[PDB]
Every structure is written in structure tokens, then in C-alpha cells.
From a paper:
Activation of the μ-opioid receptor (μOR) alleviates pain but also elicits adverse effects through diverse G proteins and β-arrestins. The μOR is the primary target of opioid drugs used in the management of pain, acute pulmonary edema, cough, diarrhea, and shivering. Here, we present the cryo-EM structures of the μOR–Gz and μOR–βarr1 complexes, revealing selective conformational preferences of μOR when engaged with specific downstream signaling transducers. Integrated receptor pharmacology, including high-resolution structural analysis, cell signaling assays, and molecular dynamics simulations, demonstrated that transmembrane helix 1 (TM1) acts as an allosteric regulator of μOR signaling bias through differential stabilization of the Gi-, Gz-, and βarr1-bound states.
Numbering used by the authors:
A (entry chain P): 1 to 5
B (entry chain R): 65 to 347
C (entry chain B): 5 to 340
D (entry chain G): 9 to 61
E (entry chain A): 5 to 57, 183 to 236, 239 to 354
Write the structure that this text describes.
């Protein structure tokens, strides 16, 4: 979920 | 060098086992149970949500390995949308199954009125539509930025940026951590309190063993969900509050938390399908 | 007191006469004919809409309309070609065990553990199907009902007796008594002058409807006989019983001719039927499938393995185009 | 005592019945099966054009 | 594709809708098979559960739950040929005449031994392995009045204990419940009937609620 950003 | 290969391997095995488990669950459901029962419909929904969420792991792994996004804007937007959409879908499906079990056990009279395959399909469609209320805004707001030697996926920042980030992160934290945890905790606690009074469970040694097995399954499911989803939410909250230096330990902790969040999707089929008694009877 | 041993002597004389009569037993003369071979009947239609255990079906004489009964409480008239439900008759008592469809197509009959045979008028005015008659007078349960005409109906009951009724009057014209156990099935002769009923005594009795007397009695089974059907020419009949065996009795020889059983079969028979040529005997088992036997070879010619529960009813069209099987999984399947 | 005697006349009626040797009844059944062999859609499959199912 | 064919198809679809609607209600309602020896108290318990506050089907609602008791006592036929249609019945309400241990008349019939034989036959029957039994013991006041005059040993030679109400009733419950050879698959709910504010229907409701809980646990895959 916390990926990319 | 060791950090990069460690993270890539972590994502690779997690993704491989997740897709294998989800697709085996699909094959078993479509071949044996035919989705003729509400619980089978919910399990199929959970498998679908988990599968698509796992499918977003190769893109993240490639993004970290190359340091840039080579897939372009078109794949970037759909991947962001799939990630948010299916994460919310899987969480809401877990909540739905927990509430379904609570209704089945603590409300037997009304369970005859409501627990029907048509209602299961209606609730699945409602969850899929409600997940769109977040999947579609992040589909539109997804953007691709360029730096001197990098191409990065992110979101467009409507003013104020600080307000927008706080709103999005708080909404995701509340609707993805606090509400599901409260729902599953209350539902399963009440379910266990009621199951303690069933004559077929509070009986001889075999009945006591069955009750203990049920309690162990409920507790392990709740604990797996909490342990898999708490670290990423907590660490994202900390990162949004204080500055963390870029070290090996920081990157490893970040990617381990992400992989644990996905490992929940990977483990859900085992907790809900493989360990389900009905599926085991399919010889 | 002397009555008992004189009856025993009469039984000995009857058995001696039957043993002297037989010299072939269908095995030494039908071994020179070609076997029917492998028969693969495919499922052409599946009739869905029943939501409980299906206990009986009866084909129409037009070979298109069909009637089925269910534990939920619905008599459904199906069109076998278009799968459309022609009629849906709600029953006052859901505990139905048999259903019948009049040869003229104007009436249907339903009965079971309610001790009453209900006659419903299909081809009526004002639209929907209404109950025309309620035949009462049995003290057990009606396990089989069959129409002779629009007014004469023969019923087999669970109180060891059969009855023949005149629908318009509603009273029994003759009562066929003599069985010491519950009567499970019935089969009218093609010319509708005789009929045969099998009972729990492992005995099948042939009755003449004109006077109301038993003409012949057949034994040989070891348990309750659940299904009976006449041969197409009316000169023979076949029974299926709980001993996992079917038997073929002949009226003129007054004795058993051939047996249909296998080592791998241990469950009882719930329904039997014949093909138009009489060469194929189709039997419904509790093993969740149906077996097609060669009536002249005692060999198993085929298997209709398409059901997920105990097939309880089995029927063949009057033109023999297809076989309809109904089971406890709430589905009828038509095979050809 | 009525049941026993009634069974006795029933057995008299049963005994005084003509029997046909099974080599004749079985032959008649086989002949009937042979005669109507062609008019059996189940024994002899019917082409799908004439098959209404 | 003809107009008559389209009308027939629409009729079939409307019949399908009606069948689906009726079927939902049938699934929701609870079926209870009422069984017991002659003169045990089936009619009395049905009449009480109705107005204490062939086949006789008795349908009524309590605490938003619909019960449909099926009494087949007046029918005279061999049971094994018609008991199979009661497969899948939610529960079996079995009535026992608790004070009948010395009233054996029927047609030396040992009417209490008849009740034991009937309970053995149906409880261990292949069609009721997973079907629970609600055991009602009627006329407990008659047992209390009679036991002090007639010893229970007249019916149970092996009985040892005082000839008063409590131990006799407990012994009879034990003698009925120990014939269950399937204790891990079905449960027996024993109760004393009484002419009070519908405690019988309350006990039936609780027992069937437990049965639905067991069935739901089987459905959700826990069991």
C-alpha cells in the first residue's frame, strides 16, 4: 500500500 | 547491493505465492462450490480482491529496482487505481465476512431471512462500488512527475497540499485500519461469547476440542490481520510527522512493512479457504 | 385348524406346478440373440424450478407434457421441448409420494401421506387449475395412482389395500385386498383390464379390475418391492425391490423369468420402466444414478449418471423418444 | 379363523390356473421385442433432424 | 420465436418468479417432526403450545420464528417406508408418558418399554443421524403422585434408589438418553412439560435456535 508516493 | 536483492526477492516470493494461492482458490471455487452459498460468494470476492492487489507487486519491484517508472503514465494511473481500489475491497470483504459470521452465529432467526446467495451478491456489488469512491479519485489524481534522471509515480496535489495529504492519509488510515479492526474485534468477540454457550461445543472432550479449535481460528485470523496491517499504517503515520534519514535500515523497514501488508492478501486464502472445512471435503 | 395345513399343501402344489412348468428361464433361449450393445443417453433438457425433494413424475400421452411432484408442495406441468412450465399447481399437503397424468390430459392426480388422492382439472375454464375431487377412504398412504380414464382411477395404499374409484361419485367401486404389507407401486395393463401391485411382503399381486379379485401372486424377492411396471405387451412385468435386484415375472407362466443384479450394486430400486420395444429396462437406484438393463440378457447396457442424489422417479414417453428421471436433488433430466 | 379359510379359497383359485411353459412365454416376449425393435428411439438412435430434443 | 412461444416463455418466467417467492418462505419456516407412542401426549402438548398463553400440520410463530409441527400419529402403516421423507427435518419432538410405567395396556405391552424401543428405533435411524431430538416428558405431576404408591421397579427391575419423584425422573431421563449411540453428531434436549406461560414453546425455540446455530456453523465452514 505505502508504495509509489 | 544486498538491500536491493533482498527487497526484490521479498517482493518476488510474496507475489508468486499470493497469485498461486488466489488462483488455486479461484479454480476450487469455480470447479467445486459453484458459488451456491453466501460464504462461497464472499470467499470468491476476497480471492478476487487479494489477487488484483498482489498483481500490483511486480510494478513496485521494477520501480524500486530501476529507480524510475518505465511503464509510463497509462500503466501508472491504472496501477495506482488497482492498488487503492483492491486494498479497500479486500479490507471491506474481510469486514463483510466477519459480520456475516456474527449474524450467522449470534442472530440465527434473522440469518434465515438475510443469509441468502442473492444478498451475498448484492453486498459484494455494494462493496465493489463503494471501493470505487476512493479508487476512482486516485485514478484521476494519479500523475507522473519527471526529475533530472527519474520518472516517478505520485498524485497531483490540490491546494493546500498539506491539507490534501492529511485528508487522504487520515481517511485511508481510518477506513482501512480503525474501522475494520473494530468491526472484526467486536464481531468475533461476541461470536465467541455466544459460541461458549452452544451445547454441541460445551460438552464432552471432543466438543471442547472443537470449541478450542474455533476460538484458535478466530484469534489467529484477527491476529494475522492486525500484525500484517499495523506496521505499514504506523510507519506511514510516523513518516508523515517526522523526518527519517535515508539509511539501509530505513529502506529495509519500509519495504518489509509494504511486503507484510501484501502478505495479508497472500495469507487470507489459507485462513479462509484452505483451512475452511467445506473446501477440505472437496476430494 | 386343518385350514392351515391344507393351505400349506395348496402352496406346495402351486410351487410344484410352477417348478414343473419352467424349463428355460429366459437364459437358454435368449443367448442366441445379439446384445443391445453400449447405450449412451445424453441429457437434452434439465427442468429446474423445484426447490425440494422430487418424488414422482408421469409423462403425458402426447409425449410432450410432463408432470412432476415435490416435497415443497408443487405439482408442475412442464413442456418437455421448450422447458417452459405450463402449469404450477400448489398442493394442500406437501407430503406427496406419487403423481399421475390422465391419458386424456384433462386431469392430474396427486397423493401421499395425506390419505387423500386429489384430482385436479387442467383443461378447465376461468383459467387456473382447480381441485376437482378428493378421494378418501385409505388409512395408510397412497404410494401410487394411475388413471384408467377420466373417471376411473386405481390407487395403491400403505394400508395393504388397493382401491378402484369412480371420480364423479367419489366412492370406491372395488377394494383389492390380500396383501399383508404396504403396497408400494402399481402398473396398469396396456389394455387397462388388469394391473399389478408390489408390496412390502416381497410379493406382487395381479388384480382384475372387473370383479376385484387377485388372479395371481408372485414371490422371489427378499425385501420390500418399491417399483413395478408392465411389459409393453401386457404379458409380463418387472419389479424392483430393496434387495438391489430387479425381477421379471410372466403372467402366463405365473413365475419369475429373469433377474437383474450386480455385485457392485447394494442399494434398493426406487423406480423401473420399460422401453417401447421392451428390450431396455431402466431402473432408478439409491446410488445416485440409473441403470439401463437389457431385458433379455440381464446385462447392464448403460448408466444415466447425471444426478447428485437418489433418483426416486423414472419415466419413458409413450412414443419412447426420451426418458425423464427425477431425483432428490430437485432436478428432472431428460435423456436421449 | 376367517383369515385362514379365506386364504384357503384364495389358494384354490390360484392353483386352478392354466400355466404356459416358460419356453413359450419367454419366446413370445423375445418375439415382441424383435417385432417392435425399429420403433424404439432409445434402442435405435433417431437422427437429430427428427429428434425433437 | 413465434408470438405464442414468447407468451409461453413469459408465462414460464412468471411461474418461476412465483416458485422462487414460495420457496424462500418454505426455507425460512422450521419443520419439526412430532413423534411418540400412543397416549403419550402429542395432542396435549400441541394444544398447550397453541393456547397455553392423516397428517396434522400445526404452523405458528413465536419470537419471530415459524414452527410447522408435522404429526402423523393417526396414520397406520410401516414407518420405515415413509420416514425417509422426513430426512432433513430440523428436529424431532419426541413425547414420552412419564407416568405410564405401570399403565401398560395398549393392545403385557410395557408401554414404557414401547417408548424406549421407539426412541431407540428413530434416534439411531439412518435418516436422523444429524437430527436433534427434543425429548418431552409429560404428566410429571402424575409421576410424582404415583411413584410414592407404585415402585418404579415394576417397570425397571434394575432400578435402585428412593421411590420419590426426583430420582425416578432423573433415572428415566438417563434411561432414555443412554440409548443414543450417536453422541458426537446429535444432541438430546430433555424437558418437563407443564401448564405454565408457554415454557414448552420457549424450550422448543431455544433448542431449534441451537440447531440453527449448529447448521450455520456447518454452513460457514467452521464445522
Amino acid at each position: 500500500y505505502x508504495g509509489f508516493x | 547491493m544486498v538491500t536491493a536483492i533482498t527487497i526484490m526477492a521479498l517482493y518476488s516470493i510474496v507475489c508468486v505465492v499470493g497469485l498461486f494461492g488466489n488462483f488455486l482458490v479461484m479454480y476450487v471455487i469455480v470447479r467445486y462450490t459453484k458459488m451456491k452459498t453466501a460464504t462461497n460468494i464472499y470467499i470468491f470476492n476476497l480471492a478476487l480482491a487479494d489477487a488484483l492487489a498482489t498483481s500490483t507487486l511486480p510494478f513496485q519491484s521494477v520501480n524500486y529496482l530501476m529507480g524510475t517508472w518505465p511503464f509510463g503514465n497509462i500503466l501508472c494511473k491504472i496501477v495506482i487505481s488497482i492498488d487503492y481500489y483492491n486494498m479497500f475491497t479486500s479490507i471491506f470483504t474481510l469486514c463483510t465476512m466477519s459480520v456475516d459470521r456474527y449474524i450467522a452465529v449470534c442472530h440465527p432467526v434473522k440469518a434465515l431471512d438475510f443469509r441468502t446467495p442473492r444478498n451475498a451478491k448484492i453486498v459484494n456489488v455494494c462493496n465493489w462500488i463503494l471501493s470505487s469512491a476512493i479508487g476512482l479519485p486516485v485514478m484521476f489524481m494519479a500523475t507522473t512527475k519527471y526529475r533530472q534522471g527519474s520518472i516517478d509515480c505520485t498524485l497531483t496535489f490540490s491546494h493546500p497540499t498539506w491539507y490534501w495529504e492529511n485528508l487522504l492519509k487520515i481517511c485511508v488510515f481510518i477506513f482501512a485500519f480503525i474501522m475494520p479492526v473494530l468491526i472484526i474485534t467486536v464481531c468475533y468477540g461476541l461470536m465467541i461469547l455466544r459460541l461458549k454457550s452452544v451445547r454441541m461445543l460445551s460438552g464432552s472432550k471432543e466438543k471442547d476440542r472443537n470449541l478450542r479449535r474455533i476460538t484458535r481460528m478466530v484469534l489467529v485470523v484477527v491476529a494475522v490481520f492486525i500484525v500484517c496491517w499495523t506496521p505499514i499504517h504506523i510507519y506511514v503515520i510516523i513518516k508523515a510527522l517526522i523526518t527519517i534519514p535515508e539509511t539501509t535500515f530505513q529502506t529495509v523497514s519500509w519495504h518489509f512493512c509494504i511486503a507484510l501488508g501484501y502478505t495479508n492478501s497472500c495469507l487470507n486464502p489459507v485462513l479462509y479457504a484452505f483451512l475452511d472445512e467445506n473446501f477440505k471435503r472437496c476430494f | 385348524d386343518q385350514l392351515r395345513q391344507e393351505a400349506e399343501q395348496l402352496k406346495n402344489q402351486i410351487r410344484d406346478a410352477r417348478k414343473a412348468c419352467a424349463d428355460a428361464t429366459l437364459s437358454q433361449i435368449t443367448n442366441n440373440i445379439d446384445p443391445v450393445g453400449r447405450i449412451q443417453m445424453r441429457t437434452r433438457r434439465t427442468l429446474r424450478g423445484h426447490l425440494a425433494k422430487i418424488y414422482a413424475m408421469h409423462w403425458g400421452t402426447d409425449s410432450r407434457l410432463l408432470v412432476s411432484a415435490s416435497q415443497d408442495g408443487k405439482l408442475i406441468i412442464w413442456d418437455s421441448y421448450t422447458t417452459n412450465k405450463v402449469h404450477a399447481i400448489p398442493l394442500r399437503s406437501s407430503w406427496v409420494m406419487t403423481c399421475a397424468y390422465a391419458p386424456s390430459g384433462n386431469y392430474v392426480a396427486c397423493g401421499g401421506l395425506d390419505n387423500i388422492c386429489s384430482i385436479y382439472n387442467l383443461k378447465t375454464r376461468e383459467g387456473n387449475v382447480r381441485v376437482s375431487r378428493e378421494l378418501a377412504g385409505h388409512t395408510g398412504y397412497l404410494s401410487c395412482c394411475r388413471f384408467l380414464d377420466d373417471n376411473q382411477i386405481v390407487t395403491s395404499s400403505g394400508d395393504t389395500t388397493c382401491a378402484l374409484w369412480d371420480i364423479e361419485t367419489g366412492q370406491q367401486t372395488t377394494t383389492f385386498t390380500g396383501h399383508t404389507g404396504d403396497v408400494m407401486s402399481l402398473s396398469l395393463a396396456p389394455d387397462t383390464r388388469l394391473f399389478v401391485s408390489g408390496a412390502c411382503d416381497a410379493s406382487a399381486k395381479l388384480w382384475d379390475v372387473r370383479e376385484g379379485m387377485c388372479r395371481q401372486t408372485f414371490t422371489g424377492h427378499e425385501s420390500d418391492i418399491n417399483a413395478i411396471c408392465f411389459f409393453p405387451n401386457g404379458n409380463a412385468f418387472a419389479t424392483g425391490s430393496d434387495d438391489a435386484t430387479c425381477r421379471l415375472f410372466d403372467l402366463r407362466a405365473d413365475q419369475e423369468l429373469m433377474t437383474y443384479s450386480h455385485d457392485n450394486i447394494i442399494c434398493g430400486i426406487t423406480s423401473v420402466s420399460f422401453s417401447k420395444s421392451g428390450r431396455l429396462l431402466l431402473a432408478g437406484y439409491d446410488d445416485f444414478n440409473c441403470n439401463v438393463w437389457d431385458a433379455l440378457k440381464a446385462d447392464r447396457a448403460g448408466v444415466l449418471a447425471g444426478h447428485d442424489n437418489r433418483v426416486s422417479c423414472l419415466g419413458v414417453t409413450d412414443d419412447g423418444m426420451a426418458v425423464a428421471t427425477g431425483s432428490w436433488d430437485s432436478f428432472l433430466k431428460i435423456w436421449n | 379363523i376367517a383369515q385362514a379359510r379365506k386364504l384357503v379359497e384364495q389358494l384354490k383359485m390360484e392353483a386352478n390356473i392354466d400355466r404356459i411353459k416358460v419356453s413359450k412365454a419367454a419366446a413370445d416376449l423375445m418375439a415382441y421385442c424383435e417385432a417392435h425393435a425399429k420403433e424404439d428411439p432409445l434402442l435405435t438412435p433417431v437422427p437429430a433432424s427428427e429428434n425433437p430434443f | 420465436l413465434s408470438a405464442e412461444d414468447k407468451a409461453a416463455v413469459e408465462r414460464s418466467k412468471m411461474i418461476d418468479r412465483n416458485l422462487r417467492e414460495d420457496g424462500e418462505k418454505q426455507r425460512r419456516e422450521i419443520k419439526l417432526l412430532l413423534l411418540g407412542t400412543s397416549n403419550s401426549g402429542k395432542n396435549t402438548i400441541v394444544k398447550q403450545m397453541k393456547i397455553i398463553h392423516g397428517i396434522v400440520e400445526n404452523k405458528f410463530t413465536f419470537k419471530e420464528l415459524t414452527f410447522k409441527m408435522v404429526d402423523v400419529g393417526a396414520q397406520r402403516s410401516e414407518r420405515k417406508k415413509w420416514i425417509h421423507c422426513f430426512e432433513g427435518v430440523t428436529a424431532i419432538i419426541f413425547c414420552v408418558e412419564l407416568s405410564g410405567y405401570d399403565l401398560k395396556l395398549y393392545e403385557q405391552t410395557s408401554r414404557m418399554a414401547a417408548s424406549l424401543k421407539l426412541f431407540d428405533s428413530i434416534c439411531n435411524n439412518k435418516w436422523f443421524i444429524d437430527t436433534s431430538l427434543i425429548l418431552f416428558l409429560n404428566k410429571k405431576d402424575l409421576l410424582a403422585e404415583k411413584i410414592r404408591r407404585i415402585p418404579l421397579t415394576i417397570c425397571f427391575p434394575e432400578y435402585k434408589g428412593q421411590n420419590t419423584y426426583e430420582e425416578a425422573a432423573v433415572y428415566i431421563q438417563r434411561q432414555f438418553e443412554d440409548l443414543n449411540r450417536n453422541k458426537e453428531t446429535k444432541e438430546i434436549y430433555s424437558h418437563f412439560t407443564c401448564s405454565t406461560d408457554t415454557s414448552n414453546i420457549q424450550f422448543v425455540f431455544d433448542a431449534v435456535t441451537d440447531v440453527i446455530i449448529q447448521n450455520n456453523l456447518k454452513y460457514i465452514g467452521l464445522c
